[PDB]
Ligand binder design. Structure first.
Ligand code: CYC
Ligand code: CYC
Ligand code: CYC
Ligand code: CYC
Ligand code: CYC
Ligand code: CYC
Ligand code: CYC
Lengths: 48, 68, 161, 160, 160, 160, 161, 161, 161, 160, 160, 160
């Protein structure tokens, strides 16, 4: 009832430790949720 | 839109957990009506004691405006 | 993560060595700079928002980056970018307190280069945003702390490029 | 260290260090040259504090060096005096770090499970660890002996 | 749009659209040509509208355009009207979409943080938008002026 | 209603109603008198409608009214038309509310479990509802007949 | 919750009655006031912040309430109080749109009297904060809507006392 | 996701352009077909179950697929397969209402090819299940809507192959 | 929670008073005992298990409590009971360091009386377990600290009865 | 305090206070006598610090004491210095405890919402605090002035 | 029991017992009289089993009944055999129940902690139970001795 | 293939093949079934590999899709991905044969001269191929991904 959830890396189910290491704290969130204005991508640079 | 307001006492009986746990076992919480059937079963299958229940939110009448 | 005091212990533990004279000298070299690190962190923390504002003003905005077609166009993305800036500033302040860059690898750089490639986030422009915050920081913290703060901003920026 | 412990709290709350946290780093580092010096006395006498501990340990509980004892024999004893040497080393590390991070990861987390497997009697071990305090403490000035003593009592605390 | 909003609620509850949801799509699409006319008129007068908003703004707040004001100077004022041009554009988008999804992702979510950084007084941006409502609304029939006005008052609302 | 649905979404996101939400309340309320007329006509012909649905049903499925049929017999048929009277009533409620909230809580959520217990063939109840659409729809103008038809097709949809 | 229209539907549903003349008259009495409710909500929503500020200024601040020992002393509690005020305003706007107070019972009043007794929150002072927002609202919304907005503020305030 | 209308808005937003004549013409081309899309959705929704049953009957069952060794053998897997079928039908109905296939990519196709390879789910057989539902749909919805419904079934099926 | 020092700060904050002279006497006392409270706290910690193996022996076991029908019968319940004992000891050590019992109310006593009534846990027997640990503690910590440790054990035990 | 902060973290890992989270407390106890003394010194000159802070503030930002300024007028200025008196008080509290703790609960959490309502320009409140640092700091020895200065810069930081 | 363990699965899935579940109850109950005989034989020889277990234990590890031993003395010994009597009793319960539910709640959950606190070697103690099995296994005819033996080996299994 | 290569070396010497050369061919035959399978797998995802390769390429080298870039524009980009589709095809051929053979004749001998004429930057074509390796390799088991990877790195090598 009262523990705020935290990341886990659990040992047991088999394969789950490495999957868990990868899903959380190894691979972040990509993809912008909204679909409103695509980011153009031809402009990496900020010269001035 | 109907929330019950239950109260229980569940006593851990399988492990002797070692830190904290006071609020885990004696607590008051409104739980919405959709889920209260399962929460009660879960309290009962852990040897919990369901001390009190209330309607709290909803009218104890029904049909329109209940299952929202 | 590790810090200078902790790194000395784990670096010796793997060799099973008591701390010896060489170890004790390293730890002294950290402790002797410690008070200065603290003062510098209090300046950065309390000027956080102004550092980002002045760093963005010198290195990001008034540009094609903030115009339609630019990656920090839209209030959404402008907010995400200066949010990022705050991360960098905040973590660099951790690294400098710890006297160890390991936290910048574990919690900031790991996967970030490719994350930015995948979203289209301009890397070179982000580095300039880092090196502008360093410039501001080095003025605010003074002779005592300037070189020590600076290195973890430089760690961050060669971590992306 | 104090840092490893004094930063982890910062990062976990997503923030720069507090005035308090900065102050303790300050006070801690000022006590560096001196803390280094308390950990050098103890390496000097590394094998002599350990030998002396061994004796005290076996008076207060000998049975371990007897027919049905975990440390019975010359090489079952060599291992025991070796474990006492391990913990003194970790105590010198802790004193120079100003906290237990290193002491803990190296020799208390998992120690119950290790020793339960070996069926070394762990609680005898706490007394053995306590003996080292007595010897080490007699080679240090009052002020330095107390500062050292906190780290000995920590291991005694964990260990059990 | 009205479409996006209806569908997202449908998919999230794992279901086909409701009679209600279908009805609003129908009423919405019937107003298509009218909504397109409202956007055209305003697109056609964009340069006039920002200006009259800009005059109304600087009378009401001559300070913003004063020594310690965010918009003080010729090019700090030029950027200010450009921002007013941005928001009028988003208002035309909203009117043709029949809701704020587009207006919101492009120019209100994150707007507090953006302007706080630039130290722009948010509530005087809200005034610049009221000023645009007043001008734009004087170039539209009563019925179309109200329909437009809802989207102006939304932006005014979101900067709050 | 349309009101309840709009508001619940508003309150759940901790916000005032959207321009969209306000617009649909306005379009909805404008159709008030018309929706009330559609309910009146159908209320006025209820006994005729249920009956013609009941004839259309028993031709298409003479088996339901056959030895091993759920509605076999005079009083197993009487209850069957009464259920058809129930659903027509709920359809009039839905039309005046402009959505299904009321229709749903009263007669679809739980309907699978109810009829499975009674062993009533659900898909032939859906047919009885199509049959009512056909009759009711022949007593309404083209425009009103469509508006009514959405609510009939919803019930047909929910029994599925 | 229920509104004008579902209040009638559920009252007839429990009797299993098709809507009759009396029912149809009630629903008309709602629909005929509907456009005015909408306009009033748009005024309240768009003046939300000003209504709270003018209501607090007339009925809460410049007082012992905001001074040490007072319940709205500390930025924490001042923030909690005007947060509450926003709830009241916002929900009253819902009740008035719905033309039914049932939402004010279900989501605002239930348990609130005792919650305030348990924290020490001054009830009489909160009522004045409600009746001051009503005063402001009734000016802003005009003849059309004044009486209709007002009643749900009065519902709120006799719900606490 | 995006629909016809937001597809245009976002294409112009990235250029920071007010909607021009070309844009306005596109949006008209959507609005002018809108009423027909709605009617078609109401036919599909209300015949959902019959479309799946007729599509399965023409393209899946009475076959090795439903026999031991087949992927839709067992009540478990038969249920999973017609569950899937309902997804396809339902989402295609969304795509056709929106007049944009983007939802079919975001919420249906992404990773699905490999998911099916990993479970062993026969791709070619699933495509036939899609193109059979299209066949049924095109009869039920009539001249008005046939071509427009059809394309999003074709989008789905070339997304797997 | 609060300690000696924050007890004073919050008592003055509600009056909006700067700290005045008598208040400052009170803070002087806490810094005077700060050495002994720390040395004393350490001793308890490493000798904890020994300490707990004397309070049970003189107040709980060798009795009907540990026999069938008794509440600390079963390894499960014996474990739960000495687990509890460790809580009490540990928190009393916090209260004594803080020089304030408020933590014993917030995190230990609140609801505990009724929790024990609900499980059947014998209250009087638990108090004796508390007052036996106090007895042992007062020997181990010496003249310096005996009275100060003792009071928070007495706070605990009159909190249950 | 330093005590509260250390303890709260302790109970969080079901653990005992370790040899580090004791050293800080010891430092604080020695520091507290000096800390108590600094607070007393600050308290003695409170009226001078506030008044001179208030002059320094209105020179640097005359706009707040001008027609459209939050602090315009004699009693809008009186309340402004009273708020400056409040924050100096909280700064003495923070110094004495050794941890900021209580000041946060008393005067920064909720401060954005409070002042936004009153329409008070937050960043000019931050300036009033810098002004107090300058005055207070000129009445303290170099070492004590720095120790005090951390708490002033914190408040300046939190209004941000 | 088998019932308690299994019904629990029924209730948790909201259903009546499976053919499988019913079958195992039937096979289980058929094996009743035999299990009752196994418990009787062992109950009938309890005093012999305990003492001969106690001799077998102290040969294999005597040190416990020696100066620094947990069971040293007449009444420190009266307790060790009493604990052996406890576990034999629980083993008879387990055999008649056909699983460990009762054995577990009464004497393993919380034990290891319990033994550990008292500082008894847990492996010393499992010898003793393993020794009790031998004396007891020998007062039963070959078929009943095996049936009893499973429950002795369970306790031996749990204590470790 | 492996066959062609072995034979050509045999015939050049004008002597029948060896009996350990009858070893590489044997390995290849077993390998070929696996090799054929890998090619089929690559063929199935061709459109995804090309497209995602093309995104990975233009991020890493945006200059080729810029004013003075060989692949600047929609149809100069279309041909560029088509060339990426060509090389993936040749990579499937190479894998299946077991020897690179045909791919060389089809797409590396003459490739410098072709692309120099078209003015295509060769080393950025090599990058497009690395990008395809990354995608293709994520759809294959570790062992098969390596076997495939050799052929990708060959093409990367030959454009050099
Ligand atoms: C952090 C502060 C805190 C405390 C103090 C605490 C006490 C506490 N004691 C409990 C049970 C218990 N407490 C005892 C205590 C005793 N038995 C005796 O006979 C003696 C008189 C006494 C020991 C001296 C026992 C035997 C139980 C188990 C009751 C049961 O079987 O359910 C439980 C029920 C949950 C569980 O079993 O763990 C709680 C929450 N919980 C907390 O969170
Ligand atoms: C479409 C979504 C969107 C918006 C709205 C947006 C606004 C925006 N306004 C800016 C500056 C500015 N904006 C203003 C605006 C004003 N000054 C005032 O006092 C008035 C309250 C207000 C005019 C009504 C001013 C004065 C600046 C210059 C501030 C500076 O340079 O420090 C800048 C930084 C300059 C630049 O690089 O373009 C951005 C990005 N960016 C976006 O992507
Ligand atoms: C705790 C360590 C940590 C970091 C550093 C981090 C960065 C990070 N930046 C992101 C996006 C982003 N990052 C930026 C950054 C910028 N835009 C520009 O044009 C500038 C060059 C630059 C600012 C100087 C932008 C604009 C996005 C949004 C991309 C999108 O629209 O999806 C995202 C994607 C999720 C999200 O949008 O929040 C992450 C995870 N995440 C983390 O967990
Ligand atoms: C730094 C963390 C750490 C520790 C402490 C550690 C201990 C450790 N002690 C061991 C053996 C041993 N340890 C002892 C110790 C004792 N015998 C007694 O009766 C006394 C109670 C005690 C001496 C005080 C003995 C006798 C052995 C030999 C046991 C055997 O070979 O079966 C072994 C196996 C031998 C080896 O491969 O090294 C390890 C790994 N390993 C670690 O990584
Ligand atoms: C201890 C925590 C705490 C603080 C800080 C606090 C501040 C506070 N400042 C207030 C007003 C005010 N505060 C100011 C302050 C200023 N005007 C400016 O332009 C400057 C930026 C600034 C002076 C540096 C002014 C001008 C008012 C009057 C605003 C009004 O009446 O509308 C009020 C309302 C009047 C009252 O009832 O007391 C409160 C409660 N209350 C608290 O409980
Ligand atoms: C081993 C697990 C398993 C089962 C049980 C199973 C049943 C199954 N029954 C089917 C049809 C059928 N099953 C029945 C059965 C009945 N009609 C009645 O009225 C009676 C109640 C009942 C006979 C007792 C009928 C009439 C059909 C034809 C329905 C149709 O074609 O529409 C079909 C579709 C035809 C086919 O392709 O084979 C399947 C897959 N499939 C499986 O993988
Ligand atoms: C039915 C579940 C259950 C069990 C098993 C149980 C055991 C139990 N064993 C005890 C003591 C003891 N038990 C032993 C047992 C042993 N000494 C050794 O060295 C051997 C390894 C072992 C004998 C095989 C000894 C020596 C004591 C006395 C320890 C003391 O007084 O400090 C005590 C405390 C004395 C008392 O008050 O009764 C309990 C409660 N209590 C229970 O409720």
């Amino acid at each position: 009832e009262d523990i705020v959830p935290y990341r886990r890396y659990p040992t047991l189910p088999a394969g789950n430790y490495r999957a868990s290491v990868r899903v959380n704290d190894e691979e972040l969130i990509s993809q912008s949720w909204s679909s409103l204005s695509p980011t153009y991508t031809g402009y990496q640079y900020v010269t001035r | 839109s109907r929330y019950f307001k239950v109260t229980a006492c569940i006593p851990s009986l399988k492990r002797v957990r070692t830190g904290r746990e006071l609020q885990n076992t004696f607590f008051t919480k409104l739980v919405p009506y959709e889920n209260w059937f399962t929460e009660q079963q879960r309290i009962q299958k852990a040897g919990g004691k369901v001390l009190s229940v209330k309607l709290f939110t909803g009218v104890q009448g029904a049909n329109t405006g209940v299952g929202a | 993560m590790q810090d200078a005091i902790t790194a000395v212990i784990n670096n010796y533990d793997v060799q099973g060595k008591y701390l010896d004279g060489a170890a004790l000298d390293k730890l002294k070299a950290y402790f002797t700079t410690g008070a200065v690190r603290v003062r510098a962190a209090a300046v950065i923390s309390s000027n956080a928002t102004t550092i980002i504002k002045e760093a963005a003003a010198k290195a990001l905005i008034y540009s094609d980056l903030t115009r339609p077609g630019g990656n920090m166009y839209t209030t959404r993305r402008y907010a995400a970018c200066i949010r990022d800036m705050d991360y960098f500033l905040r973590y660099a302040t951790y690294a400098m307190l710890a006297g160890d860059p390991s936290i910048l690898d574990e919690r900031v750089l790991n996967g970030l280069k490719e994350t930015y490639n995948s979203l289209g986030v301009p890397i070179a422009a982000t580095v300039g945003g880092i090196q502008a915050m360093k410039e501001v920081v080095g003025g605010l913290v003074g002779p005592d702390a300037a070189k020590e703060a600076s290195i973890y901003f430089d760690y961050l920026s060669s971590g992306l490029s | 260290s104090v840092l490893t412990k004094a930063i982890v709290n910062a990062d976990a709350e997503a923030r720069y260090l507090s005035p308090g946290e900065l102050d303790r780093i300050k006070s801690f580092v000022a006590s560096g040259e001196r803390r280094l010096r308390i950990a050098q006395t103890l390496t000097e006498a590394r094998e002599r504090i350990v030998k002396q501990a061994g004796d005290q340990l076996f008076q207060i509980r000998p049975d371990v060096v007897s027919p049905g004892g975990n440390a019975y024999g010359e090489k079952m004893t060599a291992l025991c005096l070796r474990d006492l040497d391990y913990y003194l080393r970790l105590v010198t590390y802790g004193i120079v770090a100003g906290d237990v991070t290193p002491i803990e990861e190296i020799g208390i987390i998992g120690v119950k499970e290790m020793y339960n497997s070996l069926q070394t009697p762990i609680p005898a071990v706490a007394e053995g660890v306590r003996a080292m305090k007595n010897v080490a403490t007699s080679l240090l000035s009052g002020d330095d002996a107390a500062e050292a003593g906190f780290y000995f009592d920590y291991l005694v605390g964990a260990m059990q």
